[PDB]
Amino acid sequence: YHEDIHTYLREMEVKCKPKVGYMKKQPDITNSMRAILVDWLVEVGEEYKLQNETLHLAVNYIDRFLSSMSVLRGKLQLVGTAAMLLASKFEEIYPPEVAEFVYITDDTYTKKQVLRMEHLVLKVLTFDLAAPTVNQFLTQYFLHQQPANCKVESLAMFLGELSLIDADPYLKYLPSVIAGAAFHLALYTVTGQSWPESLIRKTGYTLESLKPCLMDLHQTYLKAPQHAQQSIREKYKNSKYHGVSLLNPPETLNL
């Protein structure tokens, strides 16, 4: 089903895509605030040892929610908390209990607020939670490695996660394209190989077609130490991810 599934997710990523310009229509919140939020979620994912997939889902849910609902900045973390809780229920074998989510907001919100927001998010998203993620495309692409290299896999995973932080520019790119740009950049950084032939056949993406997203993600990788948000860097220093964030980015790509 590997091809059937791939085709279906390519279709779904278009339907599940958040509104590109949405933060411009939000009067009280900004891209900088969303960055703070997504970074905190990375921390949450680490404290509770959540799957990377869960974090990607939570971010999709938040972007889609904010595409249709105006939110004041004091309630932004409430949206994020509810989204992470929903993503956990969907994806995790053992999701954290609700009380654990209330604890991590440092008691800004009550447990009743968190649960009421969970329901609001479900209503706004009309229960459409099985969304395609960067992580989902990446796991598929990793199968086209020869040989498999867990330094590459971890660094693509790292770069895919960095894209979640910055709505500008990454809202305009599909999960499949971001996953494409991340895999090429990780492959090149570690080994010196490029976007494989077999993956073009699979995806229809060429290195030229991935270029605009590759240019952005290349820049994002080079300036990642100076980003206000550092949780993803700190996470990917651990031996769990083979310390991929401590690597030096390529100065160029020669594209």
């Binding site: 229920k89 074998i93 329901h119 989902q136 796991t139």
Partner: protein, 269 residues
């Protein structure tokens, strides 16, 4: 909200909630309503409801039960489904003395594999295929139901919940606690149900995990159905292959010579 629905009778309790037979007072439509209590002060919307609803909203197929509506209240969630007239287990019990015609068994298996192939091509594992969860109407259709234990899977799969599939329908890879499992687990369940349609008794009715394993090894050998012809036996053996990778997929099973002459008989109710 529920003003327009009149409850007729309680049907049963599946993985979660309660299912009622109900009629729409305005249209005359008879539906199955799944009532789901929300833990509004504790754990919120259960993960089973979150998975079943999100996934059923994607899965539109003639052989997968149709979710018609989701009705929200502060304290309850009601799922409105199409009503099917009865379950396969009840059908089989009513057929215990007279047997089920082969044309019907073949049609039922064909349709189930179509629904299952649709599920698997859409990255969904059902994980609870049993005759109680398979619903038939008066016009020859059978459909996959109760997606409360279903989940969306990844390519490649990672480790998922071990507490899955009722014992009798549980594949060897689950019983032996293998790190990974996937689509093969559903084909196993279907392999067991195929055998059970022909005999009208469960293939592997274990009383425990060890008893389950011994029953499987007794029948298959270490890693059957007399009324069945050569074509049927061949398909059955491919659905009950020990090695998950060697075990036939739903897609490939549809292209089996057993189904060359499949029709759609109307069941006897």
């Amino acid at each position: 909200s529920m003003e327009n629905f009149q409850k007729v009778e309680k049907i049963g309790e599946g993985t979660y909630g309660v299912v009622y037979k109900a009629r729409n007072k305005l249209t005359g439509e008879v539906v199955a309503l799944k009532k789901i209590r929300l833990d509004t002060e504790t754990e919120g919307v259960p993960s089973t409801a979150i998975r079943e609803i999100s996934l059923l909203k994607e899965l539109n197929h003639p052989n997968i039960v149709k979710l018609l509506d989701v009705i929200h209240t502060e304290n309850k969630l009601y799922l409105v489904f199409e009503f099917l007239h009865q379950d396969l287990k009840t059908f089989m019990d009513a057929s215990a003395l007279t047997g089920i015609p082969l044309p019907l068994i073949k049609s039922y298996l064909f349709q189930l594999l179509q629904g299952l192939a649709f599920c698997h091509s859409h990255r969904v594992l059902h994980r609870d295929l049993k005759p109680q969860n398979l619903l038939i109407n008066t016009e020859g259709a059978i459909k996959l139901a109760d997606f409360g234990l279903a989940r969306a899977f990844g390519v490649p799969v990672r480790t998922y919940t071990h507490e899955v599939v009722t014992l009798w329908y549980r594949a060897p890879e689950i019983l032996l606690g293998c790190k990974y499992y996937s689509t093969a687990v559903d084909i196993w369940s279907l392999g067991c149900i195929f055998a059970e349609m022909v005999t009208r008794r469960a293939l592997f009715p274990g009383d425990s995990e060890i008893d389950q394993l011994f029953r499987i090894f007794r029948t298959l050998g270490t890693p059957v159905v007399p009324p069945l012809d050569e074509d049927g036996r061949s398909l059955l053996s491919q659905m009950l292959h020990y090695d998950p990778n060697k075990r036939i997929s739903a897609k490939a099973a549809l292209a089996h010579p057993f189904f060359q002459d499949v029709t759609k008989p109307v069941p006897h109710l």
